[PDB]
Design a protein around this nucleic acid. Structure first.
Lengths: 75, 122, 221, 941, 79, 95, 55, 100, 103, 48
RNA sequence: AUGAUGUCAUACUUAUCCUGUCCCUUUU
C-alpha cells in the first residue's frame, strides 16, 4: 500500500529524470522538497507530470528570441 | 393525546415484535385471565349491534355493553365487551388495534381489572 | 491595574450575604457568600452588572434589614462628553448616585434606584439601618455633606464647617479625607476628618422612619 | 396520515388576512350546503390560469372536437359500451429522445424532468432567463458525485448576492416541496438554504412566510437531527429578517382551520422568540392570549408559551412572572382545550423553573387545587402534571398539607387505562413521594402494593418512555423506603420469560444497588439475587451493556459477600465461554473483564490460573469481535495481578501478541495496542530488545487507523518502548517516514518524535532532527517543523536553552519557501513563546518576531489564524510594549486592508493586558476642540 | 418617522460587546479619549501610582479621586 | 421627526386612547383584528414607552406610510394628554 | 477634501518619513505623528506589491 | 479549533458548575486543544448545565465521564479567564456522516 | 472513469517510450488512476504516434462514404482500412457527414 | 497585443514629474522611481 | 514580461471525521 506507493513514486521520479536526460530539457530544476520548478517558465510544478506538461502552454522557448537577438545581432 | 393511545399500542406491539419476544412475554402476561377488552374512540353513529357484528370475526362475544350517556340513545363513544376466551381478546388487541371503522378510527386495548362504567377517556 | 479590570473598588454587604467588586469603569461583579453544612464559607457564581461608558467613583453597600441587598455607587456617564467637540456636553454633567439592588430570589442584580447629585462627590459613608437606625448613606462632597436615603426620604444637605480665620486661600474647597463609624446597641456616631485634618463627630437626628437633621461637631485636631 | 396534509400546501398583509376570511367563508358555504342538502370540485378559467406557469396557450382545434369532449362524459359511458378493439400488422420499419444535454450533467430521475426540463433543451446563448437557466446548478447539488455537490454548493454560495433570493427560492421551494423527496436531498437543500441565508439579510423579507411553510414541517419530525437543523434555520431566518417582518408575517396562521399549521407555527414562534428574545415579543403574545374573537387563537398562543418553555428552558427565568400573568386567565376559561393546554404550559414552565420563582406561580395554585377535585379525563391528568412539577418548588410545610391532599387522588388514579395518565401519575409519584418531607411507612403501606401491582406489567416495558420513566420512579422509591424492599419484590421477575422485562428489572436493580449500596441486603434475597443475575445473563437474545454493567455493578457492590458464589459464576463463565461462537464469546469475555478485581481481592489464585491460560489459548481466535473482548479481559486481569506473578509469564504472552497487529480493525487493534501499552509501560524488562524493535517496525503502519484513540494508545506506547530502549534508533526509525501518506495519521509520527524527545532528554536528540531539516523533500521539512512545535509544547520550561538552537532554523523556515513553512514555524514560535515566559530570553524572540512580522498579510485561514496565535504568544512573552510599537502606524494607514488587520492585531493586544498598556501610549498633541495630552503623568514633585 | 436604520444583527458576527478595543475605522479623537479614560482608570486602580500622584500635588487622595472620576466623561473633550 | 420628544404614559389615561387607536387601525388595516389591538395595548403598558420602537413595530405590521401618520397622531394626542393637568386629550373635553 | 503632499510635508515637523500613500488616509496628522515616533516600526513593503511576499 | 473552524463558543457567565469531558474527548483541551500540561479546571455556565444539560461534555457534547481541564499554555496566555466555552453551534461536522 | 488528463497523457507517453509497448502491467504501476487494459486502450487510441488526429480531407470522406454502405456495422474493421485507425474518429466523421447532409 | 498584461503592469497611466525636467511617466511606480533618479537629482542640483 | 478574471485536473492543511438516531413532534 504505502510502500508500494513510495516505490511507484520513486519509479516515476526515475522515469521523469530519464525522460529529462533523454530530451535534454535545460529548464527543469529540482526543488528542496521533492518537487520540480521551471526556470524558463518561472513557475512551480506540483508533480512530475506538471513539469512534463509545460510544453504547450506558456512556451518560454519562443520568448528567448529576444535574448538570442541581443546576444547575436546576426541570424 | 386523544389519538396517541392507538399509536402507543402499535409502537409497543412493534417493539415486542422487533425485540425478539416469545409468545410468553408478548404483552399478554399482564392482561391475562380476563376477556374484557376496553374499546374507546368509536364513532357517535355506531350502534351496539353493529359493533357486536364487527367484533364477532374473532369469536362470539359473551357480554357486550356500550357506554350509556345523554339520555336519548346512550352514546358516549366507549364500549366494553367480553369475548369467549383470552385468545380471542389477544387476537382482537393484536389485529383490530388502531383500525379505522366508518370515518374516525377506534382503539382496542385490554384493561383486565374490573367492570367499571366510567373508565375510558373521551 | 486596568480600567476594565475589577479590583479598585470592593464593597461588602453588612449582612454578609454577598460581596460586590467593581472596576473604575464599565465592570461590576457581585458574588454571593453562603455558609455550607459544615459551617464553611462558600462562594457562588458572580453576577455581571457592567454598564458601558460609566465611571464609578466609590461604591458602598446599603445596610438593609435582611432584605434584598443594594449597592450604592457614584456613577458618571461619559458617553455624551465624548461625542461633543463643542464641549457643551462635558459641562453640566454631575455625578449620579445609583443604587443597584441584587434580587436574591431572581439571582440577578439590577439598577433599581438612581438619582443625580448637586455636586461631584469624593467618598460615601454607609449609615446603619434596619433595627439600628434608619437606612441610607451619607455622600461626602466639596464643602457640603448630603445624606440622601432611598425612597421617600428628603435630601438633607449640610455644608462643611471651616476653621475661624483660616490662613489658606478662600478659592480652595474642603472635602473629607477619611471617615470612621462607631456602631453600638444604644446609638451610633461617625468620625470624619477633613482636608485640614479636622476630625468632626458626625451625628444624625432621625424620626421614626426618616432622618431629621445632621448635627456635626468638631471633636479634635 | 396526519402529516401528509403537507402535500396540500400551495406556495405562499391586509390582503393576506383578507384571503383567510374568504377561505373560512367558503368553508362555511360548502359545509353549510351539505347540511342544507374536495379536490375534484370544478374549476374556472381564472383558477385555470392560476395553476400553470407563464407561456402556455389554451387555443383549441376545430369546432367538432370540443363537442366530442362535451359528449365524451356521456360517451365515456356510451362509447365504452360500443364496438372497439386494436390490432397490429407485421411490417418492416426517427426515435428522438433527451437525457440531460450538457458536458456531463449528472443524471435525472424520471420524475425530476418536470422540474429540470428547461435544462434539457439545447438552445443556448441567446437576461433573467439565463439566470434561471444557469441556476440548474441546483441539479448538480441534488444529484451527482460528492465533489460536484461540494463545488456546486460553494459556487452558489458566492452567487447569492448576484442572483438574489427571488429566483433561488422560486427554483428551490418546488424541489424541497417535491413529493418524491429523499432524506439526503432534503437535508442538502436545507444546507443550501442555510448557506445562502448567512448572506441575504434585508432581501428575504417577501419570502419569509414562503420559506416557513415548507420549513415548519421540519420541526415536527421523527428524525432528531432534522429538528435541530430546522430550529437552526428558522433561527437564522427570524434573526435574519426583522421582528415586525416575522410578526406581521405569521399572524394569519394563528386562526387557520387546520390545527397542524397552528401547532408547528407555535414551535416557530418558539424558535423566533429564542432568536429575538422574550421581552421583545411579549406584547404580541400578551395581546394574543386576551384575544376575544375565538378560542383557537388563545389555544395557539398558549401552546406558544409552552414551546417557549421547552425551547428556552432554564433561561425563561427573568420573564417568568410576566409569562404567568399572561397564561393565568386561560385556566378559568369556558372552553376546555385552553384550560388543558394552559395548565400543561404551567407544567413546562415549572419544570424549566429550577428551585425558585415559586411565588410567581403563586396566584395560579388555588384554582388548580380546586380543579383537582372536579375533573374527569385528560385535563385532570394534565393538572396532575402541573402540580407534580410544582410541589418540589413549595415549602415542606405548605407542601406538607397540599401534598397529603394530592396523595389521595394519586392513589385512586393508578388504575386508569390511559397511558398518558400513567405517564403523568408516574412522574408525579416520583416528585411527590421523592420529597424529603414525606414519611416512609406511609408510602410502604399505601403505595408500593398498588404501585407494583398496576404499574409493573408487560404493557409498560415494551414501550420506551414508559420504560425509562418507570425505571426512574422505582429508583427514587428505593432511594426513600430503602433497598431490600424494592429489590426483594422485583427479584422474582429476573426469571420472567420476556427479555425487555428482564432488561428493565435488571437495570433497575443496577441503579438501585448503585446508589444505596449492597450493605442493606440480607442473605437469602442475595442468593435469589446471584441466581437471578446468572440465570438472566445465561439467555441473551441481543448484545447490550445493560445485563453486563448490571452484573458488574451488582458484584462490585456486594464486595466480598459474593465469595461463596464464585465457582458457580466462573463455571458458567467457561461453559458459556464456549457455547455461543460469535454471539456469546465476546460477552462472557467482557464478563471476565469486569469481574477481574473481584476474582482477585478475594485471593482465589486457581481462578487466575484458569482465566490466565484459558484466555491465553483463545488468542488464536479468528473472529475479531470475540478476540477483542478476549484481549480486554486479559487487560483487566493485568491490572489486578501484577507483572512477575502473571500465570502466563510475559515471555510467553507478549510475543504471542506481537503478530496480531495486522488485524487492522479497531476491535482487535484497540484492546491489543492497549495491552501492549500496559505491559510495555509497566514491566518492560521481561522481553528482549530485539522483540521490541520488531514491535516498533510493526507499530509504524498502525498509524493508518481511521480512529483517533488507536493512534493515541499507539503513540503513548511508542514513548514507553522509547524509554525501554533509548532515543536515537527509534527517532531515526520515525525519521524514516517522509510523510508521503497524508491520510490516517502522518503528523502522528511527529507526535512520536515529540514524546520520544521527552522520554529521554531532548537535550540529546535535537541535532539529528535539525540536521534532517536539510533534506530537499519539502513535506518532511514542514514535518520536522511540526516536531519542533509539539516538542516545545510538551517540554515547556526546558526550552530556556534550546530556543537559541532552533532560532536560526526558524529564520530559514519562517523565510518562506511555501506557506506551510511560515505557518508551522509560526506555531513553533507560539508554543516556544508561551513556554519560555519570564526567564529572560526575550531578545532572540524579538529577532524572530522580525521575520514573523511580514506574514501578517494573507487571506489563507490557517496561516492567518496561525499568525494570530503566534503574535498572541509573542505578546505575552515579549510584553505588550514592543508589540504596540510594531502596531502603532498600521492603525490609521490610508488603506483599508492595513487598518482591518492592524486593528485586528491591536484588538488582540488590547483585550488582554489592557491594564498594562497605559504607559506605552505615546504623546499625541492636542488639537483645537480637544485636549489630547494627559497632563497627570507630567506632574513632578 | 421612517428612519430605515435597525442596527440589530446580520449573521451572529462582530457585534462589539467590550469597551476600549477599537475598530479599523476608529477616529483619532475617539482613540485618544479611550486612552485617556484607560489612563484615568489605571491611575484610579493602582494605589502606588495614586499615592505618587497625590504626594506631588497639594490635594488629598479622595479629592484627586473625585476629580479623576469627574473628568472621565469629557476628560479631553470628545472629538 | 415627531418621535423625538420624550413622553410618559403614566401621566395620561388609557381608556380614552383605545377608540382613536381602533379607528386608526380600522382605517389602516381595513378591518378589525386582535393582534394590532394587543400591540397597541403592549406599547402603552410601560410607564416610559419608546416611540421609535412603536414606530418600527407599526411599520412592520402596516405598510409604513399609514403607520408613520398613525405614530404622528398617537404621539401628538399623548403629548396633549401629558401636557394637560387633567391627563386627558383634547377629544375628551368636548365629549 | 484631501491635502496635497507638499502641504502635509510643510506642516509636519519630520517630513523625511511622509509617503505618497499617506495623503489618501482619513487623518494624515495622526499618521504623521505615529510614523515619527521614537521606537516605532514601519509597515511591510508588501502593502502595494502583488507577489504576496513569497513568490 | 483544529477539528472545526466554524464552531462558536458560548462565552456565557461563569457559574459554580464544574465542566466535564466525554470518554471520546478525554484529555483534550478546550481552547488550546492539546493533550499535555493541564493547569486549570473547566467551569461551565449556569444555563449551559441545567437538567439534561448537566453532566455533558463541553467540546464533544456527549456523555461526560471525567472532568475537563484547560491547558497551561492557555492558562499562561490568559485564555482560560474568559467565558464558558460550551459548544452551542454544530456546523459542517457530524451532519453528512449520519447519512453514511 | 478515464478522464485522460494531459499530465496523465504525458506520463503515459513517457512510460510507453521508456518501458515498452508489449508490457501493459509495467506501465499501469506508475499512474495510480487507470488499469492496464485502459492504459493499453489509451495508448492505442490517442497516445499512438501513428494516429492522424487532424487533416480530414475529401478523399478520406469519399472512402468512408463508399464503405459504410458495403458494411453497415463493424466500424472497427474499417478503422485501419480507411486510415483513421482511432475507432472513434470514424463514427464521429460518419455522424458529421450524416448531420451535414440532412439540414 | 498584450492589453491585459499592460493593464496589470500599470501601463498607459497618466503621470508626470515636474522635478525630473517636466518628464511624463506611464505609471505610478514609474513616476515614483522617476522622482528619485539620476535626471531628477541632476535637475535639482542644477536648480540649486 | 508580472497581474486579471475563468472552465479544469493535482498536491497540501485542519491530530477533521464513521455506529448517529427519534429519550421526547405525539398537532384533530
Amino acid at each position: 500500500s504505502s510502500e508500494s506507493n513510495r516505490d511507484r513514486r520513486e519509479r516515476l521520479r526515475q522515469l521523469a529524470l530519464e525522460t529529462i536526460d533523454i530530451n535534454k530539457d535545460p529548464y527543469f530544476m529540482k526543488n528542496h522538497l521533492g518537487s520540480y520548478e521551471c526556470k524558463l517558465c518561472l513557475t512551480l510544478h506540483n508533480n512530475e507530470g506538471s513539469y512534463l506538461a509545460h510544453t504547450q502552454g506558456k512556451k518560454h522557448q519562443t520568448n528567448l528570441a529576444r535574448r538570442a537577438a541581443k546576444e547575436a545581432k546576426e541570424a | 393525546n386523544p389519538l396517541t393511545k392507538v399509536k402507543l399500542i402499535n409502537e409497543l406491539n412493534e417493539r415486542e415484535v422487533q425485540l425478539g419476544v416469545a409468545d410468553k412475554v408478548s404483552w399478554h402476561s399482564e392482561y391475562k385471565d380476563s376477556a374484557w377488552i376496553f374499546l374507546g374512540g368509536l364513532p357517535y353513529e355506531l350502534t351496539e349491534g353493529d359493533i357486536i357484528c364487527v367484533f364477532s370475526q374473532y369469536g362470539e362475544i359473551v357480554n357486550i355493553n356500550l357506554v350509556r350517556d345523554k339520555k336519548t340513545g346512550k352514546s358516549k363513544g366507549f364500549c366494553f365487551l367480553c369475548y369467549e376466551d383470552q385468545r380471542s381478546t389477544i387476537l382482537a388487541v393484536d389485529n383490530f388495534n388502531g383500525i379505522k371503522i366508518k370515518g374516525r378510527t377506534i382503539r382496542v386495548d385490554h384493561v383486565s381489572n374490573y367492570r367499571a362504567p366510567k373508565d375510558s377517556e373521551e | 491595574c486596568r480600567r476594565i479590570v475589577p479590583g479598585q473598588f470592593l464593597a461588602v454587604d453588612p449582612k454578609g450575604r454577598a460581596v460586590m467588586i467593581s472596576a473604575i469603569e464599565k465592570q461590576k461583579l457581585v458574588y454571593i457568600l453562603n455558609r455550607d453544612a459544615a459551617a464553611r464559607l462558600t462562594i457562588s457564581s458572580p453576577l455581571e452588572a457592567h454598564k458601558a461608558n460609566t465611571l464609578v467613583y466609590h461604591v458602598v453597600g446599603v445596610d438593609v434589614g435582611f432584605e434584598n441587598p443594594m449597592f450604592a455607587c457614584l456613577e458618571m456617564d461619559y458617553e455624551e462628553a465624548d461625542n461633543d467637540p463643542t464641549g457643551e456636553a462635558a459641562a453640566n454633567t454631575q455625578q449620579t448616585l445609583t443604587f443597584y439592588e441584587l434580587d436574591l430570589g431572581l439571582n440577578h442584580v439590577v439598577r433599581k434606584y438612581s438619582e443625580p447629585l448637586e455636586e461631584h462627590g469624593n467618598f460615601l459613608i454607609t449609615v446603619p439601618g434596619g433595627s439600628d437606625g434608619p437606612s441610607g448613606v451619607l455622600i461626602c462632597s466639596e464643602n457640603y455633606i448630603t445624606y440622601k436615603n432611598f425612597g421617600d426620604q428628603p435630601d438633607i444637605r449640610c455644608p462643611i464647617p471651616r476653621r475661624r480665620n483660616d490662613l489658606d486661600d478662600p478659592e480652595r474647597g474642603m472635602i473629607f479625607v477619611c471617615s470612621a463609624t462607631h456602631k453600638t446597641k444604644s446609638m451610633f456616631f461617625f468620625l470624619a476628618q477633613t482636608e485640614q485634618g479636622d476630625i468632626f463627630k458626625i451625628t444624625l437626628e432621625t424620626d421614626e422612619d426618616m432622618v431629621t437633621e445632621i448635627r456635626l461637631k468638631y471633636f479634635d485636631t | 396520515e396526519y402529516k401528509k396534509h403537507r402535500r396540500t400546501m400551495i406556495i405562499s398583509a391586509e390582503t393576506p388576512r383578507t384571503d383567510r376570511g374568504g377561505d373560512s367563508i367558503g368553508e362555511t358555504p360548502t359545509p353549510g350546503a351539505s347540511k342544507r342538502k374536495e379536490r375534484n370540485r370544478p374549476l374556472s378559467d381564472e383558477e385555470l390560469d392560476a395553476m400553470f406557469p407563464e407561456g402556455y396557450k389554451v387555443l383549441p382545434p376545430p369546432a367538432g372536437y370540443v363537442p366530442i369532449r362535451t359528449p365524451a362524459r356521456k360517451l365515456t359511458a356510451t362509447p365504452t359500451p360500443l364496438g372497439g378493439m386494436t390490432g397490429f400488422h407485421m411490417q418492416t420499419e426517427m426515435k428522438s429522445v433527451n437525457d440531460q444535454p450538457s458536458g456531463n450533467l449528472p443524471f435525472l430521475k424520471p420524475d425530476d424532468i418536470q422540474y429540470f426540463d428547461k435544462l434539457l433543451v439545447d438552445v443556448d446563448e441567446s437576461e433573467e432567463q439565463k439566470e434561471r437557466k444557469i441556476m440548474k446548478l441546483l441539479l448538480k447539488i441534488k444529484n451527482g458525485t460528492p465533489p460536484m455537490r461540494k463545488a456546486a454548493l460553494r459556487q452558489i454560495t458566492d452567487k447569492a448576492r448576484e442572483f438574489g433570493a427571488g429566483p433561488l427560492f422560486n427554483q428551490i421551494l418546488p424541489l424541497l416541496m417535491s413529493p418524491t423527496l429523499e432524506d439526503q436531498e432534503r437535508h442538502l437543500l436545507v444546507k443550501v438554504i442555510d448557506r445562502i441565508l448567512y448572506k441575504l439579510d434585508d432581501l428575504v423579507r417577501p419570502y419569509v412566510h414562503k420559506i416557513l411553510v415548507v420549513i415548519e414541517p421540519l420541526l415536527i419530525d421523527e428524525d432528531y437531527y432534522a429538528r435541530v437543523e430546522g430550529r437552526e434555520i428558522i433561527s437564522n431566518l427570524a434573526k435574519a429578517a426583522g421582528l415586525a417582518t416575522m410578526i406581521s408575517t405569521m399572524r394569519p396562521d394563528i386562526d387557520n382551520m387546520d390545527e397542524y399549521v397552528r401547532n408547528t407555527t407555535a414551535r416557530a414562534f418558539a424558535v423566533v422568540a429564542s432568536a429575538l428574545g422574550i421581552p421583545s415579543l411579549l406584547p404580541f403574545l400578551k395581546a394574543v392570549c386576551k384575544s376575544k374573537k375565538s378560542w383557537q387563537a388563545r389555544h395557539t398562543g398558549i401552546k406558544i408559551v409552552q414551546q417557549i418553555a421547552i425551547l428556552m428552558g432554564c433561561a425563561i427565568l427573568p420573564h417568568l412572572r410576566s409569562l404567568v400573568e399572561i397564561i393565568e386567565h386561560g385556566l378559568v376559561d369556558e372552553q376546555q382545550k385552553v384550560r388543558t393546554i394552559s395548565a400543561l404550559a404551567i407544567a413546562a414552565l415549572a419544570e424549566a423553573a429550577t428551585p425558585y420563582g415559586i411565588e410567581s406561580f403563586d396566584s395560579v395554585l388555588k384554582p388548580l387545587w380546586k380543579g383537582i377535585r372536579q375533573h374527569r379525563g385528560k385535563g385532570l391528568a394534565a393538572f396532575l402534571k402541573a402540580i407534580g412539577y410544582l410541589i418540589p418548588l413549595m415549602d415542606a410545610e405548605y407542601a406538607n398539607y397540599y401534598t397529603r391532599e394530592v396523595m389521595l387522588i394519586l392513589i385512586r388514579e393508578f388504575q386508569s387505562p390511559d397511558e398518558e395518565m400513567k405517564k403523568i401519575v408516574l412522574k408525579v409519584v416520583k416528585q411527590c413521594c421523592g420529597t424529603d418531607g414525606v414519611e416512609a411507612n406511609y408510602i410502604k403501606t399505601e403505595i408500593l402494593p398498588p404501585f407494583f401491582k398496576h404499574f409493573w406489567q408487560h404493557r409498560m416495558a415494551l414501550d420506551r418512555r414508559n420504560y425509562r420513566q418507570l425505571v426512574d420512579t422505582t429508583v427514587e422509591l428505593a432511594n426513600k423506603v430503602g433497598a431490600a424492599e424494592i429489590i426483594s419484590r422485583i427479584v422474582d421477575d429476573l426469571k420472567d420469560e420476556a427479555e425487555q422485562y428482564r432488561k428493565m428489572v435488571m437495570e433497575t436493580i443496577e441503579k438501585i444497588m448503585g446508589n444505596l449500596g449492597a450493605a442493606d441486603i440480607d442473605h437469602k434475597l442475595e442468593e435469589q439475587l446471584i441466581d437471578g443475575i446468572l440465570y438472566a445473563f445465561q439467555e441473551q437474545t441481543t448484545e447490550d451493556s445493560v445485563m453486563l454493567n448490571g452484573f458488574g455493578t451488582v458484584v462490585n457492590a456486594l464486595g466480598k459477600r459474593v465469595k461463596p458464589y464464585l465457582p458457580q459464576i466462573c463455571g458458567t463463565v467457561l461453559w458459556r465461554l464456549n457455547n455461543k461462537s460469535a454471539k456469546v464469546r465476546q460477552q462472557a469475555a467482557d464478563l471476565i473483564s469486569r469481574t477481574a478485581v473481584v476474582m482477585k481481592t478475594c485471593q482465589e489464585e486457581k481462578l487466575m490460573g484458569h482465566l490466565g491460560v484459558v484466555l491465553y489459548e483463545y488468542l488464536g481466535e479468528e473472529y475479531p469481535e470475540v478476540l477483542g473482548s478476549i484481549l480486554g479481559a486479559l487487560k483487566a486481569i493485568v491490572n489486578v495481578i501484577g507483572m512477575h506473578k502473571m500465570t502466563p509469564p510475559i515471555k510467553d504472552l507478549l510475543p504471542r501478541l506481537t503478530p496480531i497487529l495486522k488485524n487492522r480493525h479497531e476491535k482487535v487493534q484497540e484492546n491489543c495496542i492497549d495491552l501492549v501499552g500496559r505491559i510495555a509501560d509497566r514491566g518492560a524488562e521481561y522481553v528482549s530488545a530485539r522483540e521490541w524493535m520488531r514491535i516498533c517496525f510493526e507499530l509504524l503502519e498502525l498509524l493508518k487507523a481511521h480512529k483517533k484513540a488507536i493512534r493515541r494508545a499507539t503513540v503513548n506506547t511508542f514513548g514507553y518502548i522509547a524509554k525501554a530502549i533509548g532515543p536515537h534508533d527509534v527517532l531515526a526509525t520515525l525519521l524514516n517516514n517522509l510523510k508521503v501518506q497524508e491520510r490516517q495519521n502522518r503528523v502522528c509520527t511527529t507526535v512520536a518524535i515529540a514524546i520520544v524527545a521527552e522520554t529521554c532528554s531532548p537535550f540529546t536528540v535535537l541535532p539529528a532532527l535539525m540536521n534532517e531539516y536539510r533534506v530537499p523533500e519539502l513535506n518532511v521539512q514542514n514535518g520536522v517543523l511540526k516536531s519542533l512545535s509539539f516538542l516545545f509544547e510538551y517540554i515547556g520550561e526546558m526550552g530556556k536553552d534550546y530556543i537559541y538552537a532552533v532560532t536560526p532554523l526558524l529564520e530559514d523556515a519562517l523565510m518562506d519557501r511555501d506557506l506551510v513553512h511560515r505557518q508551522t514555524a509560526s506555531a513553533v514560535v507560539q508554543h516556544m513563546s508561551l513556554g519560555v515566559y519570564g526567564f529572560g530570553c526575550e531578545d532572540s524572540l524579538n529577532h524572530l518576531l522580525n521575520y514573523v512580522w511580514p506574514n501578517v498579510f494573507e487571506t489563507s485561514p490557517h496561516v492567518i489564524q496561525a499568525v494570530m496565535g503566534a503574535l498572541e504568544g509573542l505578546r505575552v512573552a515579549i510584553g505588550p510594549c514592543r508589540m504596540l510599537q510594531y502596531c502603532l502606524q498600521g492603525l490609521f494607514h490610508p488603506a483599508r486592508k492595513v487598518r482591518d488587520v492592524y486593528w485586528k492585531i491591536y484588538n488582540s493586544i488590547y483585550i488582554g493586558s489592557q491594564d498594562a498598556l497605559i504607559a506605552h501610549y505615546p504623546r499625541i498633541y492636542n488639537d483645537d476642540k480637544n485636549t489630547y495630552i494627559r497632563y497627570e503623568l507630567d506632574y513632578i514633585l | 418617522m421612517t428612519d430605515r436604520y435597525t442596527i440589530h444583527s446580520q449573521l451572529e458576527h462582530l457585534q462589539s460587546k467590550y469597551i476600549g478595543t477599537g475598530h479599523a475605522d476608529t477616529t483619532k479623537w475617539e482613540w485618544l479619549v479611550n486612552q485617556h479614560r484607560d489612563s484615568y482608570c489605571s491611575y484610579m486602580g493602582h494605589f502606588d501610582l495614586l499615592n505618587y500622584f497625590a504626594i506631588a500635588e497639594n490635594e488629598s487622595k479622595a479629592r484627586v479621586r473625585f476629580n479623576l472620576m469627574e473628568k472621565m466623561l469629557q476628560p479631553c473633550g470628545p472629538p | 421627526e415627531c418621535l423625538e420628544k420624550k413622553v410618559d404614559m403614566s401621566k395620561v389615561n388609557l381608556e380614552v386612547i383605545k377608540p382613536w387607536i381602533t379607528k386608526r387601525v380600522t382605517e389602516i388595516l381595513g378591518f378589525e383584528d386582535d393582534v394590532v389591538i394587543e400591540f397597541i395595548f403592549n406599547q402603552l403598558e410601560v410607564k416610559n414607552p419608546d416611540s421609535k420602537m412603536m414606530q418600527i413595530n407599526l411599520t412592520g405590521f402596516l405598510n409604513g406610510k399609514n403607520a408613520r401618520e398613525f405614530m404622528g397622531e398617537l404621539w401628538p394626542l399623548l403629548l396633549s394628554a401629558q401636557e394637560n393637568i387633567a391627563g386627558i386629550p383634547s377629544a375628551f373635553l368636548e365629549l | 477634501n484631501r491635502f496635497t503632499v507638499a502641504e502635509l510635508k510643510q506642516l509636519v515637523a519630520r517630513p523625511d518619513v511622509v509617503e505618497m500613500h499617506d495623503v489618501t488616509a482619513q487623518d494624515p496628522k495622526l499618521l504623521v505623528h505615529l510614523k515619527a515616533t521614537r521606537n516605532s516600526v514601519p509597515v511591510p513593503r508588501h502593502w502595494c506589491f502583488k507577489r504576496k511576499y513569497l513568490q | 479549533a483544529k477539528h472545526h473552524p466554524d464552531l462558536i463558543f458560548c462565552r456565557k457567565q461563569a457559574g459554580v458548575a464544574i465542566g466535564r469531558l466525554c470518554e471520546k474527548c478525554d484529555g483534550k483541551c478546550v481552547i488550546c486543544d492539546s493533550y499535555v500540561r493541564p493547569c486549570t479546571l473547566v467551569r461551565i455556565c449556569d444555563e449551559c448545565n441545567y437538567g439534561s444539560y448537566q453532566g455533558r461534555c463541553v467540546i464533544c457534547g456527549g456523555p461526560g465521564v471525567s472532568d475537563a481541564y484547560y491547558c497551561k499554555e492557555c492558562t499562561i496566555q490568559e485564555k482560560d479567564r474568559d467565558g464558558c466555552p460550551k459548544i452551542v453551534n454544530l456546523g459542517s461536522s457530524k451532519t453528512d456522516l449520519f447519512y453514511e | 472513469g478515464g478522464v485522460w488528463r494531459n499530465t496523465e497523457d504525458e506520463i503515459l507517453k513517457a512510460a510507453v517510450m521508456k518501458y515498452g509497448k508489449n508490457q501493459w502491467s509495467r506501465i499501469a504501476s506508475l499512474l495510480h488512476r487507470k488499469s492496464a487494459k485502459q492504459c493499453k486502450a489509451r495508448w492505442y487510441e490517442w497516445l499512438d504516434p501513428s494516429i492522424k488526429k487532424t487533416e480530414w480531407s475529401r478523399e478520406e470522406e469519399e472512402k468512408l462514404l463508399h464503405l459504410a454502405k458495403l458494411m453497415p456495422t463493424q466500424w472497427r474493421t474499417i478503422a485501419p482500412i480507411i486510415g483513421r485507425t482511432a475507432a472513434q474518429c470514424l463514427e464521429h466523421y460518419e455522424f458529421l457527414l450524416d448531420k451535414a447532409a440532412q439540414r | 497585443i498584450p492589453y491585459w498584461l499592460y493593464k496589470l503592469h500599470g501601463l498607459n497611466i497618466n503621470y508626470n514629474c515636474e522635478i525630473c525636467g517636466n518628464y511624463t511617466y506611464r505609471g505610478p511606480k514609474a513616476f515614483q522611481r522617476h522622482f528619485a533618479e539620476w535626471r531628477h537629482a541632476h535637475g535639482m542640483r542644477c536648480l540649486g
